[PDB]
Design a protein around this nucleic acid. Structure first.
Ligand SMILES: Nc1nc2c(ncn2[C@@H]2O[C@H](COP(=O)(O)OP(=O)(O)NP(=O)(O)O)[C@@H](O)[C@H]2O)c(=O)[nH]1
Lengths: 258, 180, 465, 123
RNA sequence: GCCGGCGGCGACGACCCAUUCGAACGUCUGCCCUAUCAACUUUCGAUGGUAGUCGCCGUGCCUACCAUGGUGACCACGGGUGACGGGGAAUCAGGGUUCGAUUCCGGAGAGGGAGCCUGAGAAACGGCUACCACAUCCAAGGAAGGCAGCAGGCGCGCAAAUUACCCACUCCCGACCCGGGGAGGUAGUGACGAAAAAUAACAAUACAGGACUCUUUCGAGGCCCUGUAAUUGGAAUGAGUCCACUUUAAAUCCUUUAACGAGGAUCCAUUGGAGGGCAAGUCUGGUGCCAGCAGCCGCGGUAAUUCCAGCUCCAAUAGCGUAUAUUAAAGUUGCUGCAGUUAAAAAGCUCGUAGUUGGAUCUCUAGCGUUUACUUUGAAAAAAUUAGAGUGUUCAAAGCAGGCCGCCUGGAUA
RNA sequence: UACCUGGUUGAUCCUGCCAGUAGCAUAUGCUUGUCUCAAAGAUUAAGCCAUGCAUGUCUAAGUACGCACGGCCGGUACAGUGAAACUGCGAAUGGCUCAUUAAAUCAGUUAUGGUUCCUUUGGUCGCUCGUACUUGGAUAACUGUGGUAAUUCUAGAGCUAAUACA
């Protein structure tokens, strides 16, 4: 069609939001921002559907327009603003801080953090370039362009940024025997340790990840995010420890709890 | 575009040959025994049984160590133990094929209301249920085709409001009491 | 069922008794239905255009008119033309207001086969000096005498002498008395002739300001066609006559006396009915039982359309939408399946009183001389007309000329109509024709007619047809 | 003989609300009107019945229970601000103007056809 | 505010880089019928080369000068399509056949073509300019057109609803918590179709009724059944009528619940059959190879098991006929899986290119090993749909919810 | 549920089709008590349309000398609500329909190292060596005179704004 699309049909929305069929015809339609439309989360969904604070669409803008909600220590009134992976949502009214981490089954989970941990965030560097009198530059997965990076930071490494400033505190290299998390494909939300990468020139690089419970799986390089140094994570994990336990013991656990 | 679902399903299959003695008899025996309204209700239970049997048959063909067969098999058997057409002893997938229409028609609320001695005939039970006299747990049901769960069996009581149970005279008794 | 039917009849009886015992009296009367008849080219219309002050008269594609319509003049216009000469009763409260209905006059289709839908409270008869009395004028006064209603007679061509001092918008008495004596003597001689020519036809006529005693007397009002002298005197005599005579009959009561007057086929509206809404507060989205050719039709009103005041049902005007409407006006109604309907019959409006039937054999007595005489069983010619009135006119011509007719329709010609003319062609080659009066021929119909052996007679002036 | 229970509560500081799921037990009588639910809930939480708002009551089949949504505001000012107009109009704190969509959209399309201050004059 | 200057918190802007939403050009593989279409394209660009022009860029996109190429029985080119393409639908052993205008994705066009302004984005039509076809007003000078948006009307036909109410929900747009939205929501019409489910149940009387016990039979009972009783009896009740709520933007429907409401419970169950296929009458009137029935075989010509009726019975049942496209039956399109001596069928005969098929045999040093097909594993692959886990919608078709006395959950999986 | 049955003969066994049987869709007939869910001018004509409505928009924050309102305080440029108009943005989304279209559309897979991109979100914005304590002209709105039978037609005259135009 002519020009860009403005709407989004409800059934055409990405599955990990878990919008039901009958509520309406349209969906939230995440607006342009740091994270991709397919792999983000509108605040209207997070507030209304996940935290169960707002009932209707009006209550969400009535919350947001009173400027009670910050994303990465910055006030956002846009109810369809895309907050994606590693983004820290802060409610300073009720003093509640959330980090958006994918759960085992492959969706953003309502994972609370201490206010002391809502100071920094981890970020995967997309590229590294230099320009105009050679001040080198870095670009990350949440589109934060940072000047004068540490020259030890190469492409596909992770960096820890203080949210109040815009400067790198510490960084993790992408090497063998490092804790990573999958952010795309069948294995989305699984945490594990790198074993090796198999470089395919002129094509996608494939990496092999071993889980804590002896489960080994492969994934594309683009869908990898280093979260810890060695085996120890630099952030809190969700309810489960990123362990994909199968339907058999899912049933056994559920029936055991009953 | 409208915010409506069009997910609707047929619950009965008509017979291939419309007029056939031996068959018509067998269906009329089932109606007569369990006071069913019409032959749709017999075909409904045949269709549901057939689908359970087809699920069991297509599970058997997979190998005995397959995770999918194990999980699906256990879930099917659990549900058929839950509804009360099997027991813990006979809880093998092979035995699913050895069920029949009688086993499923026994679990109708109409049948159980008759078998527990609330009603004094198979025809009386269907009326009594439909008239809002019967209730399971604390829920007043008026659905003859309510398939009763094994654990939910031990309490089918008269709905408290009911004249028969609750203790409130109806139109006939009220009218006879006023003209008495 | 029968008990619902019985109580339905009894609640109908209650309602009409309430609508009889309601009966509001003490002034606030109903607008009279002023009828206008003539011969052929006398001046029965265009005098109405002069009353309402409309510039478009000649836009008829012919000197003759072929439909019924009500101009709907409302008090401001009466007061405006009254203040010009100012006779009596400045800002009269007692006047309902005027409603003039135009009738087409002609030798052929016997003056609209009239049957002028009766309801001619004040009938205006153009005499038109120049030519004297006419055969349609004598048969019209015979019709006016048949059902005893009060009617008056107006002259048109008084200025057409060559010597008349044309002083427009002034008193007839004054303008006549301001001429030479020999012309007055000529006018009083031809007046005497007209008075004798009415006297012999069981009337008693005279010149509108002598006695007058209009109980027995009839008023000869001299009017000018082009200039408009007498138009004041006309409307004065009309309101006077209606005030004096029609004091009790014109009560604003609450019965249901809506009458089906004309049927029309308009583009993007379906088949519309023109009704003279006289008594009954009928509502938008309320059921009506319209009397049809092939039995009665239950019709649901989509809405009420009215033309602007001082404008006719002549040319497609900006018809204003009205949700509801009081009982003193002539309005256009449209709904679903108004295809076959009869003209000059009363219209029953029904609320939700579970279907109130059977009022048709009590209407259809000796008025069966209409479209119903259709011989589908036999062969015949196909006929189409703009309005129903024109269709009746064509059928009674065919009846007089002795030709059978198979199918009839209202609106423009289509490929099904030429196919009905084609399915006739097998039987009698001569009879396979379509008589289309003042309707738009379609390209597909015309090319299908030319491809087959089917001729179509298209004509706006009925003489040509 | 009516018993009020509350199911899922929440202290919504973000909208200055206490929002909850109302469970009404009324075995013999009809569905209890909203005003009695309001005052009994107001009595239960020790607040004015003016600052209480309840809706969406669906009486179960058999007629023993009715489930609905309730919310109590910290003060009537926050209630006046945050609560939608339709739920004020039921309490009688808000008035709607008696004009149809047809009328206002008609007058709009007439108002288009004149330029200048005469737009206000066309009425 | 701080000792005449120096400042904190925003909002509009902004050359350029990154990003998000895209968009546009491409790469590889895949489509229905037709040989009564066998060669096509290249004058006027067809295939490629060099140089430019134009374009947001790559490029015969276009111009100039050269080369003579490019595609094709592995079906080009041409013609047809009651052809928009997919996700899917119906049917179904396994294989298949048929449909897919239609709610999600992509494409296209606003009566037919063509040209363009503005803008980041249009060759826009609820923007403009011209022509072609239709057509509105008119003082005859000129003016104004676009429902394949929602209603509605005409036409066409076997074939399809209201000129309704509201931005409250789902979302979109704007300087914007505040405005607007026939997107959309809610009613009305609705036997397209799908799920649940009334039209009675029980008790007491007599059977030249049945079974079980006694007597060899006759004839004996609160052991269990029975109906074509308008016999007898109170008990139960939804359909309707109609308070009050609840529901809702406001209403409606449903659920809830006062009052009324069952003895031909006349508060009445229909649509098709009763020779065979195929479940049900060689019963009685009527007609007399006339009238008609009959999908097929056949029935009717004076005792009609079949016609028109009465009575009775059968079938499915709030539904059941009839017509027509299509699927299984059809192993009557055959790959699985059919035929060709006589039932329809092997060319009169041989050669022969393309096509298909083709005899044994051979036991790793950051680059390899002779390269594939085959087979097993891995990542990638939109939801909805389909299969299928969990969950008492009062059950079910559904829905994605829910459950416990502020809490513990789910929204799997294939 | 991997299914068959009548019909060529005096009878038989075949080949073979016609007929029956069930499902699904469009129409249509007769019938129609309760309740939930629910398709619906596609086929023929992408044929033609009266009428009404479907795209508009303001925050403390671009331009307020409309008394349209009342309010201070009266020597306070501008208290405020705010019609109108200039300016900014949107109107290229949505909705409808299936005429066209046969390596085209489209689907799965890859490429832009060969390109543009409003907006959002980051980066950048005294890095340049050469009246400023704020420069210039107009035009709407408004007032006043008009023309044409006619349209959301507009000419002439008098003032005045900028985040418009310089
Ligand atoms: N001076 C004058 N003009 C006249 C007279 N009668 C008719 N006219 C004029 O003649 C012309 C045509 O007459 P018209 O009014 O159409 O006659 P009609 O009898 O009303 N015709 P219709 O049958 O249509 O009703 C008009 O211009 C009309 O004014 C008359 O007597 N005198």
């Amino acid at each position: 069609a002519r020009g860009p699309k403005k709407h989004l049909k409800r059934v055409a929305a990405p599955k990990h939001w878990m919008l039901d069929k009958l509520t309406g015809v349209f969906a939230p339609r995440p607006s342009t921002g740091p994270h991709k439309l397919r792999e983000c989360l509108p605040l209207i969904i997070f507030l209304r559907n996940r935290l169960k604070y707002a009932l209707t669409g009006d209550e969400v803008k009535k919350i947001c327009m009173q400027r009670f909600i910050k994303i990465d220590g910055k006030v956002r009134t846009d109810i369809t603003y895309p907050a994606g992976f590693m983004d820290v949502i802060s409610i300073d009214k009720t003093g509640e801080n959330f980090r958006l981490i994918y759960d085992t089954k492959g969706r953003f989970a309502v994972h609370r953090i201490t206010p002391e941990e809502a100071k920094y965030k981890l970020c995967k560097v997309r590229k590294i370039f230099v320009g105009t009198k050679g001040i080198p530059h870095l670009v990350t997965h949440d589109a934060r362009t940072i000047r004068y990076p540490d020259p030890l930071i190469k492409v596909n490494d992770t960096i820890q940024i203080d949210l109040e400033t815009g400067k790198i505190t510490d960084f993790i290299k992408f090497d063998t025997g490092n804790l990573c998390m999958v952010t795309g494909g069948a294995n989305l939300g699984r945490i594990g340790v790198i074993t090796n990468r198999e470089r395919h020139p002129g094509s996608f690089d494939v990496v092999h990840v071993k889980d804590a419970n002896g489960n080994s799986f492969a994934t594309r390089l683009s869908n990898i995010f280093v979260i810890g140094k060695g085996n120890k994570p630099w952030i809190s994990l969700p309810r489960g420890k990123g362990i994909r336990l199968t339907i058999a013991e899912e049933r056994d656990k559920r029936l055991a709890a009953k | 575009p409208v915010a409506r679902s069009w997910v609707c399903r047929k619950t009965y299959v008509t017979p291939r040959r419309p007029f056939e003695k031996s068959r018509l008899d067998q269906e009329l025996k089932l109606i007569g025994e369990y006071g069913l309204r019409n032959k749709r209700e017999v075909w409904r239970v045949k269709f549901t049984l057939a689908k359970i049997r087809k699920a069991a048959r297509e599970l058997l063909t997979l190998d005995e160590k397959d995770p999918r067969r194990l999980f699906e098999g256990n879930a099917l058997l659990r549900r058929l133990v839950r509804i009360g057409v099997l027991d813990e002893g006979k809880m093998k997938l092979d035995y699913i094929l050895g069920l029949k229409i009688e086993d499923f028609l026994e679990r109708r609320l109409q049948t159980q209301v008759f078998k527990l001695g609330l009603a004094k005939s198979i025809h009386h039970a269907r009326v009594l249920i439909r008239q809002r006299h019967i209730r399971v747990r604390k829920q007043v049901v008026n659905i003859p085709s309510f398939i009763v769960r094994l654990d939910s069996q031990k309490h089918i009581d008269f709905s408290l409001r009911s004249p028969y149970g609750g203790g409130r005279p109806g139109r006939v008794k009220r009218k006879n009491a006023k003209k008495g | 069922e029968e008990r619902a039917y019985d109580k339905a009849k009894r609640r109908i009886e209650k309602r009409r008794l309430e609508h009889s015992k309601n009966v509001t009296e003490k002034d606030k009367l109903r607008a009279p239905i002023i009828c206008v008849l003539g011969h052929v080219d006398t001046g029965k219309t265009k005098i109405l255009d002069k009353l309402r002050h409309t510039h478009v008269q000649d836009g008829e594609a012919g000197g003759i008119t072929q439909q019924i319509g009500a101009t709907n003049v409302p008090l401001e216009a009466i007061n405006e033309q009254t203040k010009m000469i100012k006779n009596f009763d400045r800002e009269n409260v007692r006047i309902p207001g005027m409603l003039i209905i135009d009738t087409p006059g002609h030798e052929s289709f016997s003056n609209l086969r009239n049957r002028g839908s009766s309801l001619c409270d004040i009938a205006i008869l153009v005499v038109d000096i120049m030519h004297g009395l006419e055969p349609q004028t004598i048969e019209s006064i015979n019709l006016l005498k048949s059902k005893k209603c009060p009617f008056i007679v107006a002259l048109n061509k008084i200025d057409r002498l060559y010597d008349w001092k044309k002083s427009p918008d002034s008193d007839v008495a004054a303008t006549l008395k301001k001429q030479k004596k020999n012309t007055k003597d000529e006018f009083e001689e031809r007046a005497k002739a007209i008075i004798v020519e009415f006297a012999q036809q069981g009337l008693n006529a005279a010149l509108f300001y002598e006695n007058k005693d209009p109980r027995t007397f009839v008023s000869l009002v001299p009017t000018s066609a082009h200039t408009g002298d007498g138009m004041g005197s006309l409307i004065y005599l009309l309101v006077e006559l209606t005030q004096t005579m029609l004091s009790k009959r014109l009560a604003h009561c609450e019965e249901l006396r809506a009458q089906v007057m004309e049927v029309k086929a308009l583009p993007g509206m379906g088949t519309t009915i023109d009704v003279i809404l006289i008594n009954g507060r009928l509502k938008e989205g309320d059921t009506i039982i319209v009397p049809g050719v092939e039995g009665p039709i239950v019709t649901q009103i989509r809405g009420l359309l009215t033309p602007p005041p001082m404008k006719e049902l002549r040319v497609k005007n900006q018809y204003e939408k009205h949700k509801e409407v009081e009982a003193a006006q002539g309005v256009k109604i449209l709904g679903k399946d108004l295809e076959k309907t009869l003209a000059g019959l009363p219209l029953l409006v029904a609320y939700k009183e579970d279907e109130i039937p059977v009022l048709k054999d009590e209407l259809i007595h000796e008025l069966k001389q209409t479209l119903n005489a259709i011989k589908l069983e036999e062969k015949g010619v196909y006929v189409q007309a703009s309005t129903l009135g024109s269709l009746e006119a064509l059928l009674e011509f065919l009846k007089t000329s002795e030709v059978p007719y198979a199918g009839i329709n209202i609106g423009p010609v289509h490929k099904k109509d030429v196919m009905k003319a084609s399915v006739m062609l097998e039987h009698d080659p001569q009879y396979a024709v379509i008589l289309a009066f003042d309707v738009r021929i379609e390209r597909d119909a015309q090319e299908m007619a030319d491809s087959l052996g089917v001729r179509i007679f298209s004509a706006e002036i009925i003489y040509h047809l | 003989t009516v018993t009020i229970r509350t199911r899922k509560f929440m202290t919504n500081r973000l909208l200055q609300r206490k929002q909850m799921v109302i469970d009404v037990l009324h075995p013999g009588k009809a569905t209890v009107p909203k005003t009695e639910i309001r005052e009994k809930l107001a009595k239960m939480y020790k607040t004015t019945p003016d600052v209480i708002f309840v809706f969406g009551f669906r009486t179960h089949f058999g007629g023993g229970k009715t489930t609905g949504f309730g919310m109590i505001y910290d003060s009537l000012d926050y209630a006046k601000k945050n609560e939608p107009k339709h739920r004020l109009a039921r309490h009688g704190l808000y008035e709607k103007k008696k004009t149809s969509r047809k009328q206002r959209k008609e007058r709009k399309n007439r108002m288009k056809k004149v330029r200048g201050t005469a737009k206000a004059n066309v009425g």
